[PDB]
Ligand binder design. Sequence first.
Ligand SMILES: O=C(O)CCOc1ccccc1
Lengths: 237, 300
Amino acid sequence: GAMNSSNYAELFNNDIKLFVDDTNVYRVTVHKTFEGNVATKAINGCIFTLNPKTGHLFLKIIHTSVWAGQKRLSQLAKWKTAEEVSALVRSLPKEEQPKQIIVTRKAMLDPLEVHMLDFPNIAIRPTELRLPFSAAMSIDKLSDVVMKATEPQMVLFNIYDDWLDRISSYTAFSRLTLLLRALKTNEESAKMILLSDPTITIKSYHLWPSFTDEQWITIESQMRDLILTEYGRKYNV
Amino acid sequence: MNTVPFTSAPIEVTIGIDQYSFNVKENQPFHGIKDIPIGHVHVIHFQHADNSSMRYGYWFDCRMGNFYIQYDPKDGLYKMMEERDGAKFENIVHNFKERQMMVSYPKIDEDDTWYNLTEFVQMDKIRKIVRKDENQFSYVDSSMTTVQENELSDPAHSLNYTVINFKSREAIRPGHEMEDFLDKSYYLNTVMLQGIFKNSSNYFGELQFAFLNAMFFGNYGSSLQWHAMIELICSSATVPKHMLDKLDEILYYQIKTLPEQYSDILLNERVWNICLYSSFQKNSLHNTEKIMENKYPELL
Ligand SMILES: O=C(O)CCOc1ccccc1
């Protein structure tokens, strides 16, 4: 079935689940040709696959070479995503394989179901949550490793840093989605909020700054204000 | 010509014989159907006046024996039986005619509709889909589920249609996931035609049988099968040319025969828009497309 906010706590029970977001798999710049036409050039992309209970992000880098000589790339991208997620599941020990995969875009359902035929007991589901995972490429260290890749590559991160040492997975996911929604809504201002104190640093193995508990409360407030400010600007409220 | 006599007609009923229908009143002096063109296949079907729930009937080949109908007051339905005493049967059907309490099968000579609907339908293949080996005829009704449907609860009383499932390992070669899902030609040609049906005649025969069970009994699983078998052909980029041209004819006569007021429940909009306007064979169903647009534009 489809996921939503009635059964929202279920995301953090002990059944393993994986969100898959394909919005950054096929990425282009749109530029003008010598004959005056407009032409695309692909740039590196990524599959965003996240277990929300543990913070484990499996970031598969999609190198531009996979598109060479291919047609209908937006369609192919969904099948490429499905192929790689299926491969990820097969590479995991059985006790680590998900019981559900939740796709952020309904167009991924048939490609993933077809690639996952060998796993009849893994449920493939859409969700009715509007998740901001498209803004994953606003996280500086994720963007950097994607744009630097010269070959297909799988990179691993805990997208929650060390937060689970102090907060629940429900709370961590809420913090993540708030940060990413802010980055999606006003990227440059959201980055300013995060980097405005140069004495709070990002650990070498972390994605986010080493905020204390009280500093996170302040940051989260500033992020909620950013989002509300942009809503008011957009709708003249 | 053959005869299907009735012992009596104790309950008011609508009786179908092939594409025709007539009514019988309660305890009307009715003793069956005469003048039936021997064919290769026939169907006699029933819908009771006092309870239109359960349509039901019997597929039969007049060449495989002498068949009659007798009402069963315990089970409450008209049952087909076979008469093994031929001289007894000739004695009835050479008289009951001599009494004139039978309706005449009314075949207009211009009308080739029944073999256009059943050319590929065979009784030996029917008896594999409807498994009741002790009888030479096959009972179908409105409620019978299909083997496939049972996999998603009395297997004896099921319709054993060939399972077609576009999102199954049978349909999709490992390593060819996108290819085989977007172009079902492998599944059609290697798996279904070469592997299971053996030739297109057997394929069209099940397709035709499924259509007729959907139309005559309102059997939902049959409708699913009919549509699935159309969609498999239309979703294949590579189909023999004889098969496409023959499919257009087969579908045209099915659409032509369909009751006009039954289109909301016997035609799946998604499937038909895909086959006529989006599929590999959108340009190969010229006559079907023309009858569909001029008879059922609202669906499209
Ligand atoms: O939980 C941690 O922080 C260490 C494990 O981190 C992983 C992250 C992605 C995949 C696998 C493990």
